[PDB]
Subunit: 233 residues, 8 copies
């Protein structure tokens, strides 16, 4: 016989900064726009709140919880047996839904992070396979260059600057160096690209993420549950 | 007549991360956006659920299963007991879920198999092109040998290289040029970044493992209810 | 007096991967988006199915086949004289239409491939005409450079690195080499661009395409033709 | 009164590949997308067919030909016999098809002829610009000769070139610079990639061959029916 | 009492190629899309035809000319006193409007070309003023470099390659050359950019344009004026 | 009561080429598209014409002037004679045309004057920045002189230059570095392409000449009629 | 009993050039499009005019001022006791609103400029902190290079061109120079980027802005306040 | 019953410049456009004002506060005296203004604090990557030392450098290479532009100062009126 009401809306951008940051680490340029996250989050609360209303109606002693767009933020209400009771229950049910959806979001985020980590680790591995193939081919090129240097009887380097060399100019390094590059192939480091190090960077960032109760929020109060001064009618 | 209801919606992004990753490996920049994937997946469950509903009508004793926008979707089932309505709704949801998941998994494995084949063929044809380029390079070296012989340059005439062109190859000297020609068969091909990107994508597609965890097509907002009143 | 029904929708992306790949080889960046292909394909089945329904009505003994959007996938139906008969005929007519449209698609794809091949072959030819003109001009430049080298009495090369040369610096290669480059012009390879080799690559890919019954599909079952348990009414 | 009907739709992409290729040669990046071409072509058949219908009304004995959305389009013809309705519908479709194809073919040949002329003119004017650039280069060489004479540099003073500038041309030496000037008339023009792209497009436009296979404007979903009942 | 009708639509792309080309020379990347030109052109005919209809109604003896979208191409009509007369007049009035609008288009195009030519000529002039300022500044730099070379007593060049020089390295060319570059400044050619030569190219193309009766068209017949077989009613 | 009508529409592109060119000089990439300019201009005539109509209502003897879509526009005037209706309509169109043209011309001249001022100020501030950069370069040269003195390098130690850096300036030698410092006052500023683009735009804006031919705001599809009937 | 009317619309682009320029200096690529400024400005006048109408109605002796779209430009009106009075008051009230909104705009612009100046000044400061860190690191690199040069006993430079040096090739400058670069680190200028000088450029432009009564306008007359020839009715 | 009204609209761009600057520091290219910020801010005031209206209804003696489009917005309050209506409307506007401003300020400070933390963590992880790159460089130097020893190159063999590669590092000579290895611990890390951009953003975020002037959420078009009539 007494109705408490509250008005809620999307969480503020500062309050979801943690979640936004995590999404940007995971998805990069494909991460959702913050305004879209805001809509998604309040939407999730809204549908969960509506479901709770159904649960509360499906009782031997039904309870009346409502939610609907304020215009035509969201206006929510609860009908209680007393003014204090209605207010208290509305606050309780808002918190109940909040706790439920936050837990789901946190768990899904941790799942996402774990998968992203595994995928980045796998990507480093396969990128290393490719880099190893490239190194192996370079050693082959050096082996061929040694043939050419041996034919020209070039044992010492003929170039007077540090510079790129290709299959056709490698012989100019001279057979002394070329032989050493071949003999020591096993300890020659791989040539890793900026893209490879971007993968490592992302993996480090993903592993640094910590999902907590502060990471995301799904609503804010425009008006907290009211203590109705008059009974319904 | 007891009615059970449930409320379902699109799967969460974490729950389709495997599928999303696979689509990105297979399609690259043309892979669907995550939000679009979500809509597609719940849509697929939804049409399958409507189809089951109906199938269930086409029985000696027809059953009433429904689905409609409640954002999410509300599904309902009319049973002859409270527990029966709840249990059968849950079972029918799982039945549709299992069916759609199997179809998606098999289609994805098919897609991966074809992608692998296509990438392998691509490496083969790219190698044909790389071979033609090597063959032409050897011809350029053969011509540069003529020029070096005419200038009587047997040893390299350089102090650095800025990169090697048809017109300056002769400066490498006939001793080296002759050796490059003699040993052409053991000269490695010059592969491009695009070739290695093809190899990279092939390694990644072969690394995909499609399991029951790879994709999902719905999540519960509210599980099937046990109706308190008929 | 007995109605069988089925529900069908667009083919899955994995089931049209072959067709999609072929389209990407043929059209490159202009190839249709896979979702658009899906719509096109089911659309083609749909219109062919509707045409069949007209054909079946235009009979001394009319038959009733229907198709329409399920909502407010596509729902199709057939009205038969018995439950088993209706189901069997609906399945038959779906397969009949499927076979017809698949054949059209396959034949059009093979036509497209043949034309693409011819066009790529022609493009290689014309690109070679251009490359030949560029080589011919370079030989002319070398002829002029020989004049300059002869005037400066430069017979041996004056540069100490491999590098690009232009009309004004070609003379620095010296008249011995320049004369040889001119004398041997016929055996000087053409200078082919990355774009030229992209054309060759595409031609190789186009020739590797094989159109089969697995290449494309135009529908999938959401629900296979039903065996109706009750007569109409 | 017997009615025959047919169902037609846009031509297939394979069947307009020739026309599409030609449009791409002529217009490049501004060529219409294939799907747009398809819509344009069936649209052209459609308006021509309506026009024939309406013509056929304007007769001492009016005939009824129609076209409407069936998504595809449904066309119909009312004849005085079953075979007549079918035969005349097929003939009228072919009549319109022949008319539209001839118009498209002639317009495309006109477009190709003008494009050829435009490309040829473009090569001419580009050559005028290339000539002005060569003339200026010779003037730069004439000035560099002055500087080389003042420094008394007759032979080249370099070991490589990095890029050749007005200010460092003199390092090539007066012997070579004088020869470059003396022989200016036989110095080839320096043509750019854009010039060769113009030549490339000209070769390709000249390679186009417009035939009855080049374009199509419809395909049958269902050929004209033989009506079983009046 | 007799109505002749015709159906017309936008001119074909091949028939407006001349106009399209001229517009592309004048406006470059800002030239209208050919489909937009097509719409503009038929639109111009349409409004002129409607105006003629008003002119023909405003007569001591009114005549009835009509135009309207065929569906909800354009359908036009004329009502004459005889079948042959109606057809002949409709054809006449279509040609009359065609001639009028073509003349306007041709004259506006020639006006546009003349203005474009003047603007390009002016642009070459101002670009040359800028290039002259750049040359003047370079001569100043060379004057300063001569000071530095004189202080270091560098009379001969100290660099062994052709290369770019800047204010700080110009002195390495040596005072003999630097003095000559200064003494001969008047005959030093300006350094013109690719953008400058693009302006010259466009000017040459603009001057090559020739506007004729074939340059543009504004309609094509879908159906030529009919000879009505029956009077109205 | 005699009514005269005319049909008018947006000015042609050739007839607003001057105005379009000016807008492009002043605004560059932010200049309005031609088609948008056309719409803007006829729109301006239209509102001015409506205003004249409201003016003409607010008279001891009200006059009726109208404008409406024929999209083109149809304008009309109700006169007391046939010739009067025609003549007054033509005069009122010209009256509005003259008024709008004068406003556009004056506004454009204002815009040009401000643009000139802004470009001149921009050259001044850009020069301040260029001066700061020169001053810093001289400081770098002063430091390089210290390093050259410590290494006792008085003459240049190079054979080419690849860029000149703070750390390799000393290789130019103290004789030259000292001279660069001593003569800093006569060292020209190093101006960028952007600086010269500002100069270019200034020359072009100063070249604009606004005349009665620069812009137009309508064209006649049909001139005011002489009505044959009242 | 007498109504004066006027018609007004958005200010012309030339009349708001000053404001537009200021906005472009402040916001760069994010500055509003001029057409959007035009709409904003007339909109501001419009709402202020409507507010004035409310103020004038809220009087012991109400006055009737109106504004509304001409179709569903803006048409404004005032109802006075005489023809001359109505016209005079309408003109007065238009000017009154004009003065009010112009003052607000000017003050907000000056506020914006002051803040932009402060922000640019702060940005130069922080950019200098970064440049100083980069210089400090370079001095560290030079310190390490001195170690290497000392080990190789390289006191004089070994390179024969001006060029970039890195950590690994700095030693080639020789210990005499390297020691001097270290000893004189305090007087080594910072290495400022083009982005840094763009910040300085913008600051200079911002400081050159002068907001006056000519800077912006918010309306223009299509028709000035009329002197009504007849009373209302 | 006396009604006071006011007309309010979005805050001006100058009045939210602080907030806009902060958003740009924190979000960069993803920062909201100014016009969008304006709409967001007045929207926030508006919903808070509606909420106050309810609050004021839920009283033993209900009060009537309203807000609606006039765009701008018109707000009104019904009081029991003319001065009371005006005064209470002004107070309620200020009350809502104070509440929303405090929320925005606290949220912005929270956002800044998290951004600072995130940037600091980013510098740490970027440094881990830079360290791995340095460690690999030292390994390359260790290998180049082997090659130099084999060629017996102890002193540098170069006249310039074009960058330094694994394959040409040996030309620096074993004396220098050994020293580079011996002194690896004091070799500075090689930081990228992106690293310094992170440092730059951190300095700027730390420079932000959130005050009552940072943001505003409305401006008055018309202040609360003193109604002359009941």
């Amino acid at each position: 016989k007494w109705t408490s009401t509250a008005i809620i809306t999307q969480p503020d951008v500062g309050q979801i900064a943690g979640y936004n940051n995590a999404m940007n680490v995971i998805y990069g340029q494909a991460a959702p726009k913050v305004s879209d996250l805001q809509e998604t989050l309040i939407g999730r609360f809204s549908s969960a709140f509506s479901a709770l209303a159904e649960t509360l109606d499906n009782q031997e002693e039904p309870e009346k919880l409502t939610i609907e767009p304020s215009v035509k933020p969201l206006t929510v209400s609860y009908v209680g047996q007393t003014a204090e009771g209605a207010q208290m229950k509305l606050a309780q049910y808002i918190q109940q839904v909040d706790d439920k959806v936050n837990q789901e979001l946190e768990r899904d985020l941790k799942d996402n992070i774990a998968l992203g980590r595994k995928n980045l680790q796998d990507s480093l591995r396969t990128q290393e396979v490719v880099a190893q193939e490239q190194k192996d081919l370079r050693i082959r090129q050096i082996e061929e260059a040694l043939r050419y240097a041996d034919e020209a009887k070039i044992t010492q380097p003929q170039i007077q600057q540090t510079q790129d060399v290709t299959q056709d100019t490698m012989f100019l390094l001279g057979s002394d160096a070329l032989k050493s590059m071949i003999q020591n192939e096993a300890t020659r480091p791989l040539a890793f690209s900026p893209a490879y190090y971007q993968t490592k960077q992302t993996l480090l960032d993903i592993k640094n993420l910590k999902v907590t109760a502060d990471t995301v929020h799904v609503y804010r109060y425009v008006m907290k549950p009211t203590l109705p001064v008059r009974r319904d009618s």
